[PDB]
Amino acid sequence: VSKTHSFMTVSLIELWERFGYYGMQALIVYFMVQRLGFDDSRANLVWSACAALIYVSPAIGGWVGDKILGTKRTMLLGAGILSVGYALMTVPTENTWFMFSALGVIVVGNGLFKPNAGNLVRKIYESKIDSAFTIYYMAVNVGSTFSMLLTPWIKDYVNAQYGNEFGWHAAFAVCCVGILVGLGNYALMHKSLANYGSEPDTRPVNKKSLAIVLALAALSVVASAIILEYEDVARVFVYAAGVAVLGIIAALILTVQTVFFFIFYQQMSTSLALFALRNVDWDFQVFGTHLWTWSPAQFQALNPIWIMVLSPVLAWIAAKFALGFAVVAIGFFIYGFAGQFAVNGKTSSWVMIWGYASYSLGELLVSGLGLAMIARYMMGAYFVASGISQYLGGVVANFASVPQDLVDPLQTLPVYTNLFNKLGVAAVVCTIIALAVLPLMRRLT
């Protein structure tokens, strides 16, 4: 049909997938802390292990779509399995194993979806694949803006019109029908747009291998649910993946810096979220009237929004890594200076907006210089180092962990802004690593 048509279908299904995903991420730690009974140290480690899995997952799943089932087949199977994940997330049971299983299903499902929608964009564009990929990574952001704004509101509204359950499960259902909407989209655009793409989808599905894939898939959901459940299993697994990834020259410092950057990134799912829930005035004032009043989770929506606001402006050299780190640093110093001004126990609001403005500028600046640069100069090692630093990002967000019996926001405020200030300095050390290693880029060329 067309290249922009195919790319359209795949970027749309991407958009709705990410809607579901971030709609769930914006609520998951609050669920574990507020609805389930978890302390924020566990909530962090569990969610961070889950992210590590989710991010090491597409390594296996990308290979399945190229070399075993179709890339379109595997993408679809991934989207279905994902849908079942949120489905489990909406049955109103506070049985941690039920929920961890729902999460495992999301891990398996995501490993099967993400890499293959990504390949489709690339097969659809045969350097205009960058033309494609930026628009792609934008579509992601409008989707995740929509859900990270909506699902916290559904949670609140339903939690009010009804009692505690669903509320959350209402929100996870919203995720599930987002996924379903995406699937119906593709289905109404299937051979139509996509048509040509995938290496082994040009023939019928191999029922022995679909059987073995689904079997091993089920086994992976149980593997996940257990790794999430026992922190020690996760720790040992991440540690093993650690000594293993490090076991196996230019892309080195690049991927290392990627680890650092990902610790800074994992902070918004976790410590920034809890800080936002506990020491931020959810009342947004446009100096000086009132519209409107945040729902703490909705602060995370500030990330894709700002990436959407500053993306057209930036449209108008791993030194961009350096600048990235610097801007992430003053982002964290704005969160650190969240005490020294705009404070009444729990107060700030604009602290979150400027904080996130800065932080996500640093993201846009480093949101490109990863896959493109390494793939223009392995994928597994990158995915393991990335998942690993997601977990590490969890144990770092743990440095601001507030005991459950400590609720005087006047006392929780320092513990957060100590972490945030220390990250700000940690980010400047990375800025020095970035610029120092810069002539090592000139020796090779």
- Of the two residues 66 and 156, which places its CB atom closer to ligand LMT in the complex? 156
CB of 362 to ligand LMT, least distance (A): 23
Cα–Cα distance measured from residue 48 to residue 255, given in angstroms and rounded to the nearest whole number: 19
Q: Please report, for residues 103, 173, 210, 321, the alpha-carbon distance to residue 424 in angstroms, rounded to integers and kept in the order given.
A: 32, 37, 48, 15
What is the torsional sign of CA 150, 165, 231, 415? positive
Residue with tokens 């790794």: 227
CB of 156 to ligand LMT, least distance (A): 4
How many beta carbons lie within 10 A of that of residue 317, not counting itself? Answer: 10
Q: CB under 6 A: which stretch of 33-41, 141-149, 315-323, 417-425 binds ligand LMT?
A: 141-149
Residue type, 406: L
Spatial contact of 237 and 227, defined as CB atoms under 8 Å apart: yes
CB of 154 to ligand LMT, least distance (A): 8
Q: Does 149 bind ligand LMT (CB under 6 A)?
A: yes
Q: Does 297 bind ligand LMT (CB under 6 A)?
A: no
What is the torsion angle, in degrees rounded to the nearest 10, for the CA atoms of residue 330, residue 331, residue 336 and residue 342? 110
Q: CB under 6 A: which stretch of 73-81, 143-151, 273-281, 362-370 binds ligand LMT?
A: 143-151
Q: Does 293 bind ligand LMT (CB under 6 A)?
A: yes
Compute the half-sphere exposure of residue 55: CA atoms within 13 Å on the CB side of its CA.
Answer: 22
**Is the preceding omega at residue 380 within 30 degrees of 0, hence cis?**
no
Q: CB under 6 A: which stretch of 170-178, 255-263, 288-296, 350-358 binds ligand LMT?
A: 288-296
Q: What would the two tokens of residue 301 be? A: 């929506």
- For 7, residues 6+ apart whose C-beta sits below 8 A from its C-beta are 121, 124, 125, 132, 135, 136
Among 145, 267, 367, 431, binds ligand LMT (CB under 6 A): 145
CB of 272 to ligand LMT, least distance (A): 18
Q: What would the two tokens of residue 412 be? A: 């929780």
Q: CB under 6 A: which stretch of 47-55, 104-112, 147-155, 193-201 binds ligand LMT?
A: 147-155
Q: Does 151 bind ligand LMT (CB under 6 A)?
A: no
Residue 178 pairs in a beta bridge with: none
What string marks each residue from 152 to 191 as x (binds ligand LMT by CB under 6 A) or -? -x--x-----------------------------------
- For 138, residues 6+ apart whose C-beta sits below 8 A from its C-beta are 308, 311
Among 146, 166, 321, 420, binds ligand LMT (CB under 6 A): 146
Q: Does 71 bind ligand LMT (CB under 6 A)?
A: no
Residue nearest to ligand LMT (CB): 146
- Of the two residues 130 and 283, which places its CB atom closer to ligand LMT in the complex? 283
Burial of residue 120, with CB atoms counted within 10 A of its CB: 0-12 exposed, 13-18 middle, 19 or more buried:
buried
CB of 287 to ligand LMT, least distance (A): 18
Among 142, 214, 223, 428, binds ligand LMT (CB under 6 A): 142
Residue with tokens 């989710």: 54
CB of 24 to ligand LMT, least distance (A): 16
Please report, as residue ranges, which positions from 398 to 417 form the binding site for ligand LMT (by CB under 6 A): none
Q: What would the two tokens of residue 328 be? A: 């992430």
CB of 284 to ligand LMT, least distance (A): 9
Cα–Cα distance measured from residue 373 to residue 318, given in angstroms and rounded to the nearest whole number: 10
Cα–Cα distance measured from residue 261 to residue 390, given in angstroms and rounded to the nearest whole number: 10
Q: Does 150 bind ligand LMT (CB under 6 A)?
A: yes
- Of the two residues 164 and 404, which places its CB atom closer to ligand LMT in the complex? 164
CB of 130 to ligand LMT, least distance (A): 24
Cα–Cα distance measured from residue 260 to residue 270, given in angstroms and rounded to the nearest whole number: 16
Q: Does 284 bind ligand LMT (CB under 6 A)?
A: no
Task: Kindly state the greatest CA–CA separation across the chain.
Answer: 66
What string marks each residue from 83 to 122 as x (binds ligand LMT by CB under 6 A) or -? ----------------------------------------
- For 436, residues 6+ apart whose C-beta sits below 8 A from its C-beta are none
Alpha helices by DSSP H, listed for 285-408, are 302-314, 319-336, 350-366, 371-374, 379-397
Residue with tokens 């916290």: 152
Among 162, 196, 239, 292, binds ligand LMT (CB under 6 A): 292
CB of 294 to ligand LMT, least distance (A): 6
Spatial contact of 269 and 25, defined as CB atoms under 8 Å apart: yes
- Of the two residues 162 and 341, which places its CB atom closer to ligand LMT in the complex? 162
Among 220, 224, 258, 295, binds ligand LMT (CB under 6 A): 295
Contacting positions for ligand LMT (CB under 6 A)? 142, 145-146, 149-150, 153, 156, 292-293, 295
